[PDB]
């Protein structure tokens, strides 16, 4: 519940190592004495595992992740491990997988169980008539929303006193593959050599529950007993491991069990064992895989003339809605970051643009219908809004794409004399056309009077004037309205608008002038004409380049030098090896320079011997006298 542990102390994270553990049966398949390999989420050899234990003032309970899949050791003596809380986010809003056994039943409930602030199991009253009674059945608060309650057959809950050795060595492998919360276990009673768990172990499946949920966390229901405020915790430890996608080489016996299990990436000798499908390697040099120089990073060069954005947007001579000055925008740097920092706007409405890729994606033909109107008439210029503007003189179509940008200039365009020169339309004769300037300057005849210029009797003059007083309200302010229309995907893009540094002599992954290339970037010496950009080789590939931002001649040398060569003697002779990389320069990392490549882990000799293990270029290898692997030029014969 909430009673805190008196024996809780922050013990340091002792990083022990899973030596030979982590080998399980993959499925129900039998073979007879083959060397079968596979690759799956495994506990790797000689990898860190966090040492956990209990003592009379150190007793903890870590929230541990269950992301990939976990390994679990347990060196009990008197059942210090009791149960498991396999909760995803340790919440009762979702269902937490509870596993518990009080030496009666392995009770599995896929239910919503609330994690208490300090749940604890344990035993007490072990002086007279003990019978292994339990401390507190208060490891939860809520109990609801059960999909599948389950009781398996109870395992060997060791009520028998087996003290001393770690014979209660419980190996638990837990993972999920497609809703299968599988238990891969095998209780292996140890044989005492010197006090420690190490040896060749094999594990098997026990039960599966096809549930279909995820779990990302776990704790473990511990026990308390004294050889925990009133009944302390004894001396019993365990390890905690994970699962990583290693590649094993399993050897089977005659009658079922695994005999040898060899992980690949532990040393390249084991990699050679993986490749050759043999646990015993004969005498000779071999070849495991390839070598790949890693690309370090990338170099991207953005393009840098400018569109009239300090000119049209900062103009003085303006237009009207009755006749708008259609700006011609074609093949200019569409600087939309200087459109972005302008916080002086009033109404900025971008309908069908790519507003994240303003500078990235660029457009075919941009038409800026910029015209200054009265303040209230901004809400009508929209696909979906009509009225005094949209159906009278200036129609955006229903296939409109572009922005509508407005900002006020009440300090300059307002006047006591008033900006009555910019005239606007009030009535409507014909159905309004999209993107067509209606400049019909004829009297709006609404009757049987042929006006033809005169006003008065049935002669309506809708060509009215802006009253831009210096004390205008919010509806009469002169807004510098720009409806930035454009044309999308009907031409190759003309109106088109943060580069990186230059890194030479390193294996990077550049992106110069559309192509994303990879190689060590040096500087060439050729004669590039200023239009000539791409050097081609005899193999018709990219050889020598130039930055489109800064004029400079470059040279490219590709990465991924050669492959992996493995030098070994006979396995019955020795198990020390030597590493050779195929025709590389000594860069990666004893270290020798040969014509065959950079040699690793050998001794050079000022003599010459008869060739046993050849390498190349008249250089052979041998295991002579401490005995090690020496590198030497081959003896050509007896100088008789």
């Amino acid at each position, epitope marked *: 519940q909430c009673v805190n542990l008196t024996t809780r102390t922050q013990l340091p994270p002792a990083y022990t190592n899973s030596f030979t553990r982590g080998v399980y049966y993959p499925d129900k398949v039998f073979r007879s004495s083959v060397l079968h390999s596979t690759q799956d989420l495994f506990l790797p050899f000689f990898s860190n595992v966090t040492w956990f234990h209990a003592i009379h003032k150190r007793f903890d309970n870590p929230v541990l992740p269950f992301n990939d899949g976990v390994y679990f050791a347990s060196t009990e003596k008197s059942n210090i491990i009791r149960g498991w809380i396999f909760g995803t986010t340790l919440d009762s809003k979702t269902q937490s997988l509870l596993i518990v056994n009080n030496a009666t039943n392995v009770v599995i409930k896929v239910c919503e169980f609330q994690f208490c602030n300090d749940p604890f199991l344990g035993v007490y009253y072990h002086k007279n008539n003990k019978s292994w009674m339990e401390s507190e059945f208060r490891v939860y608060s809520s109990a609801n929303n059960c999909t599948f309650e389950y009781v398996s057959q109870p395992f060997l809950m060791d009520l028998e006193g087996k003290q001393g050795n770690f014979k209660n060595l419980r190996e638990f492998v837990f993972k999920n593959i497609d809703g299968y919360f599988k238990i891969y276990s095998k209780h292996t009673p140890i044989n005492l050599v010197r006090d420690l768990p190490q040896g060749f172990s094999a594990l098997e499946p026990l039960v599966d529950l096809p549930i279909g949920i995820n779990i990302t966390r776990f704790q473990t229901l511990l026990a308390l007993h004294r050889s925990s405020s009133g009944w302390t915790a004894g001396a019993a430890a365990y390890y905690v491991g994970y699962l990583q996608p290693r590649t094993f080489l399993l050897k089977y016996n005659e009658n079922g069990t695994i005999t040898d299990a060899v992980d690949c990436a532990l040393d390249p000798l084991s990699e050679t064992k993986c490749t050759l499908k043999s646990f015993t390697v004969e005498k000779g040099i071999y070849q495991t895989s390839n070598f790949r120089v890693q690309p370090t990073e990338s170099i991207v060069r953005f393009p840098n003339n400018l569109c009239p954005f300090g000119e049209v947007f900062n103009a003085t001579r303006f237009a009207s809605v009755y006749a708008w000055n259609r700006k011609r925008i074609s093949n200019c740097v569409a600087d939309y970051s200087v459109l972005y920092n302008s916080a002086s706007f009033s109404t*900025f409405k971008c309908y069908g643009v790519s507003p*994240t890729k303003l500078n990235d994606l660029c457009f075919t033909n941009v038409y800026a219908d910029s015209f200054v109107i009265r303040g209230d008439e901004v809400r009508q210029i929209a696909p979906g809004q009509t009225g005094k503007i949209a159906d009278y003189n200036y129609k955006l179509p229903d296939d409109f794409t572009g922005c509508v940008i407005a900002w006020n200039s009440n300090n300059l365009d307002s006047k006591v004399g008033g900006n009555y020169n910019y005239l606007y339309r009030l009535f409507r004769k014909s159905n309004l056309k999209p993107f067509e300037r209606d400049i019909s300057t004829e009297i709006y005849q609404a009757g049987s009077t042929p006006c033809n210029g005169v006003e008065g009797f049935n002669c309506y003059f809708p060509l009215q004037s802006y009253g831009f007083q210096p004390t205008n309200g919010v509806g009469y302010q002169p807004y510098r309205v720009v409806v930035l229309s454009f044309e999308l995907l009907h031409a190759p893009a003309t109106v088109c608008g943060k580069s990186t540094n230059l890194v030479k002599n390193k294996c990077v992954n550049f992106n110069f002038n559309g192509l994303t290339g990879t190689g060590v970037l040096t500087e060439s010496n050729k004669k590039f004409l200023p239009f000539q950009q791409f050097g081609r080789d005899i193999a018709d590939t990219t050889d020598a380049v130039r930055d489109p931002q800064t004029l400079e001649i470059l040279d490219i040398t590709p990465c991924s030098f050669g492959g992996v060569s493995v030098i070994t003697p006979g396995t019955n002779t020795s198990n020390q090896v030597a590493v050779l990389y195929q025709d590389v320069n000594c860069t990666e990392v004893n270290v020798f320079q040969t014509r065959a490549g950079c040699l690793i882990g050998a001794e050079h000799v000022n003599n010459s011997y008869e060739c046993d293990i050849p390498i190349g270029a008249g250089i052979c290898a041998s295991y002579q006298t401490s005995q090690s692997i020496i590198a030497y030029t081959m003896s050509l014969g007896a100088e008789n």
Partner: nanobody
Amino acid sequence: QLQLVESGGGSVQSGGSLRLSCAASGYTYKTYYETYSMGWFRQAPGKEREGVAAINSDGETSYADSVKGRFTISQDNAKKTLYLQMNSLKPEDMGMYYCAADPAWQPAFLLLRSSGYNYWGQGTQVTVSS
């Protein structure tokens, strides 16, 4: 005509943790996109309709600094449903919440101004007792 359905109200105390939700209705989605400029325009008893939590089509959230640090507006574009996790309601959070609509893209300094919203929802009410 583009319409919206406010919901998510609830009469709580001073410091309530609720969530708003704006169900998308209407007939016009006048854009080639499904991402829009929206915002929960609260109109308090005794104050005007004000931009409290607003977000545009790119995700630039617009907040007021008196209510900043508690609320969480999340425009779920896969269902066109605007949300506002009303966390720890101060006593000025009472009011009729209006999610407004726009088929366009507004910046961070114009999402709070309700002058450019020609499509308005119904409205939801939250009673924040002090």
